[model samples]
Structure formats: C-alpha cells, structure tokens
Target: PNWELLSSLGEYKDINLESSNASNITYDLEKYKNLDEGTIVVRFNSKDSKIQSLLGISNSKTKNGYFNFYVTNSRVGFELRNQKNEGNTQNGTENLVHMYKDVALNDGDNTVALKIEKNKGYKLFLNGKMIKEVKDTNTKFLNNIENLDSAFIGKTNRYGQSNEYNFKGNIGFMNIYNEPLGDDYLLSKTGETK
Candidate 1:
C-alpha cells in the first residue's frame, strides 16, 4: 500500500494479486466502482522488508482510478484516487490518503485492510486492529471514477512503474470485498492473539 481495508474476514476470494507485473490481476473496474461499500485487504510477510507498492487498481483507458497501497520511510499507507475534474488542486481532485506514519507493517504473514463507503469515508486496519491513520486536510469520499479497468497486487500502474512506492515482501492474500468485513473476523485470520 502507498497508503489503503475488511469484513467477511476470510469469506471472500483471495484476488490472487500477489502482483509485481509478474503476478498481477485484472478486474472490471467500472463495474467494481459502482459498489457503494467495499473493502480491500492484502496479506504479506517479508523479512526486513522495505518500501514497496503492495497493491493497485486503475482504469488504463483513462487512468483515473488511482488506488494503491505501499510502504515508505518505514511507514505504511494507502491512497484512493478516483475520478478527476476541474478543481483548484493541480491533480483536478483530492485524494483519500490514510497513512500510519508511526505504525509500520510487522513481519510475518501480516495483513492490511481498507474500507471505503460512498458519502462516508475510509477506515484502515493493520492486522485486523483499527489504527489511527493520517489524512490530508482536503481528503474526502468523492470516488466516482467512470471506467475502472485494471488491478494488481504488490505493484502499481498498467503502463509504467516509474513512480511506484517500494515494497519488498512476501504476499499471502489480496482480496476485495463487496461488503465491509468484521474486525474480529479479520483479527482471527491474522493469527495474532494476545
């Protein structure tokens, strides 16, 4: 994740998005974005891992859906960049970012999750525990991208990997849930009991 969710815990299908171009997965983005509520979950375990692009989804036709998860400077985060329009900002639209600056992804079969709802906002979870997330002042839930096209895990972009965040780790699962899953259920899947 550059910055990015759960419910069903382990009921949904793992997207097989252990991506890096070599292991990328594609989906019908236009159809998926019409969903009002959903969750994106990724599982990875790396030894002394560093920055990386964990997962991404975009509409290559127009390249609007800028969804990504990543690690940087030892911090973990996710970004949801939907449709763009004529706006004050340079990028045309504001992005939804939730970065856990002080919280780093732990080693071994770790999982991260993001929940997105229309008109609402986003919730971030690390290993199933909801943690404090970083947000931009202009962040909002304005995700109405028209044509969602491609998606992958452990990487970014269907064209170039030039501006990708660094993520070097072992991925176990990359799942997209139509309905937001439960925290306790996700917690159980993380195998972290204390």
Candidate 2:
C-alpha cells in the first residue's frame, strides 16, 4: 500500500511479519516480474460463517486465463475458480480442482499459488505444495481487465467495502505471473511444490 492508499483507508495497521530461519516466508515480486501466460495467487486470513473471504488476481495483460483461489471455514479446503471472460460473455466457470488437505493457514505466513498455461493446464500450489491440477482446453482471457493490478490481500470484501473480516495475520508476499510454470520451478522457488 502507498501514500494514496493509506490516506483513503486511514490508519490501516501493518501486520507484523517475523522473518527467521524457521520462517522461510517471502513475498516474491521478482518471480512474476515478466510473465506471459497469465496466472494469479490470492491469499486470505479468515472468513465469516457464510461470507467466505475472497483472494484472487486477474490480468488481461497475461493471455486471458483467470484463476480465483479461495478458502472457506466450511472445510471446502482450497478451491480454484477457472474461467475466461470475453467481453460480457463468460464460460468455463468451474471449481476445476478441490484439495482435501488440512493445511491450517492462519496468524502467520501461508502461501497459495495458481498457474495458467496456454496449452498445458492449470496447477494450484498451496503452502508450497502442488495440491491439485486441472487439464482442459487451453483458453485465455479476452477482456478489458488489464493488469494483475487489482488484488485483495487479506480479509477484505469483494466489493472493496470496509470489511471487518480483515485477515488477522502476517501477509509477507504475493506474486503474480503471466505464465504457467513447471512443477520443478514452483517447488524450487517455494521449497515444496506438492
């Protein structure tokens, strides 16, 4: 967040990020600096009973593939929303893949990754593990949603409201990419691509 953001939001407390040898957490901006295949990773803290917290990244700049990553208290576990919206038309709105792993992400640095490829498929990594993968017709986004610039890092509402469900943890890093990376690359950078 910058000066302009701070002024509008007012007194938004910064989450304390404790980095140590045991905490290999990083918000890697360099990894996705120059991507062409289009991918997004949205991180969250917690959510209400029904009003689940939303974390997502969208970019028309990277091909057109859109990936929405979210977690629910209902143990929906980790979910992937894959869709390619063209103008006012949208298709392929599926959960794609659902992982039943019990990775408790809270009060600290937890990571989630979504990778999109032009031909290969979609791969999702949670906490540096490759939990799920979806293979389908390679599609790209064709819309005006330029740049992966719009992202809700924490427990904020989807409509940009003053959400009380703000994430209550240290969000150290979130990286956006324009391409689908191989399992080896993800594991190497994240240290345990499942």
Candidate 3:
C-alpha cells in the first residue's frame, strides 16, 4: 500500500479559520502504522504568513515529542521531536534542520512535498521540483512520530495542549504515503515541466 490517507480530489475547500482551531482537518495516523520511508504531500493556496502549520502531530501532553510541518519566513520547514538515534537537532535527539528558503506562496494552489528515506536523507519539493535535500538522517522514526488520534490539517496538533498554529486559505488535497515515491510521481501530482 502506498498511502495512509488521501483526501478528496478535484475539490478546493476554503480553510476559513473562523476560530483559532476550528478550520482544520483531522485524521489518525496510527491505523496506517508508522512511517520509516515515506512522503507527505500537500497542495494549497495561501498568501498569509508567519508560523502557519500545514500538518503536525504530537503524542503526549507531557510535550515529549512532536512532528510539525510549517511555513515561516518564506521557508518551508519540518521539525520532528527526537528519538534515541542520530537526529539533527536539540542535541541529536531531534532531527533535520533543512529548510528551503524563499518558497512561493501562490494565490493559486501550489504543491509541497516531504520525502523521508532511512539513513539517506530528506527531500523537499515545491511545485514538482526538488528544492532541498538533506542526506544525514540516520534512524527509524515510527515510534518518534506516531500519534494515534491527532493527525491534523490546516493546524498543528498536540496531545493535551492547545495548538495555535493554523492555516488560512484553500486546501486542494493532501496525501501521506508509506514509501518515498519518485520524482515523476510527484511531478504527476503537481504541475509544469522539469
């Protein structure tokens, strides 16, 4: 199987954040199991900025760890709480500080992708093109990022705590895969020439 969750296609839903945490989508990542080598893909249109979460998860109220995907300072960043392996942040318990800068937040829908491969690297793509690649990931991340009931869209989700990081605009779709799909596959899902 290639996907854990694939949202509805050919539909653009307005992420009208009428409230702080009211305009987000929620899903459970536990049932699809954990991701060792996988991809998280999202398509959206937004011009608003300053710490908006596209996807995120946390498993505990103790603030043990969390995986967050967001945009800040014209950059798309992924932050994951660390485990007992060679992570890249917070003194090796955390991972990956790769952020591709000056990402375009189009008025029309644009696509961004995060592909994770064990011990090799993490690749970030925008609009069907590879923008950033970090070749230093060195661990299995299932236990580190597995949250049974708190996968969310348009907002960051945490267990036992309130999340203020939320999205504003139109969300076309999101796809979470069990393996890192290729460039052509991502290109097919996005647009334009290489």
Poorly placed runs, candidate 3 (over 4 Å): 1-27, 82-100, 137-142, 146-149, 159-163, 192-194
Q: Against the hidden true structure, what lDDT does model 3 obtain?
A: 0.60
- lDDT for each residue of candidate 3 in 1-194, tens digit (9 for 90 to 100): 44434443213244544343534333455533366667777776655776777776554332435567777537787776643322232333445243555665555667788777777878888876787777765844445553334556666555344454667765566677666777666766665322
Q: Can you rank all candidates by TM-score, best first?
A: 3, 1, 2
Give the residue spans of candidate 2 off by over 4 A. 1-36, 41-54, 57-67, 73-107, 140-150, 155-166, 192-194
Q: Cα deviation in Å at residue 74, candidate 1?
A: 3.1
Give the higher-lDDT candidate: 1 or 3.
3
lDDT per model, in order?
0.54, 0.40, 0.60
lDDT of 1 by residue, 128-171 (tens): 57765333334333144445566556665533333544345556
Backbone clashes, each candidate = 21, 10, 2
TM values, all candidates: 0.66, 0.47, 0.72
lDDT of 2 at 171: 41
Clash pairs, candidate 3, are 82-93, 88-95
TM-score winner among the candidates? 3
User: Considering only N, C-alpha and C atoms within 3 Å, which residue pairs clash in candidate 2?
Assistant: 27-173, 37-178, 37-179, 38-178, 38-179, 64-141, 65-141, 129-194, 130-194, 155-167
